[PDB]
Amino acid sequence: GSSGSSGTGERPYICTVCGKAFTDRSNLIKHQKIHTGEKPSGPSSG
Ligand SMILES: [Zn+2]
């Protein structure tokens, strides 16, 4: 296998949509931009 991370330790904020973690709240909010904005105003139905 192959997994490289800062090491041990968890985060306070965690995207309750995909399953991602974030140290700073702001950072998290910026990430949601992917769940709130994925496709433009078109025939798409989410
Ligand atoms: Zn997410």
Side-chain angles (χ1 to χ4, degrees), residues 15-20 22 28 31-32 34-35:
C15 192
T16 61
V17 177
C18 55
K20 178 166 272 89
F22 293 84
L28 172 59
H31 166 82
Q32 296 180 43
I34 80 181
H35 309 301

Side-chain angles (χ1 to χ4, degrees), residues 2-35:
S2 54
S3 298
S5 277
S6 59
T8 307
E10 278 193 336
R11 271 152 271 276
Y13 322 95
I14 294 83
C15 192
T16 61
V17 177
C18 55
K20 178 166 272 89
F22 293 84
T23 308
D24 197 29
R25 170 80 150 159
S26 278
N27 283 355
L28 172 59
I29 302 165
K30 173 182 79 87
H31 166 82
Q32 296 180 43
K33 289 198 196 275
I34 80 181
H35 309 301

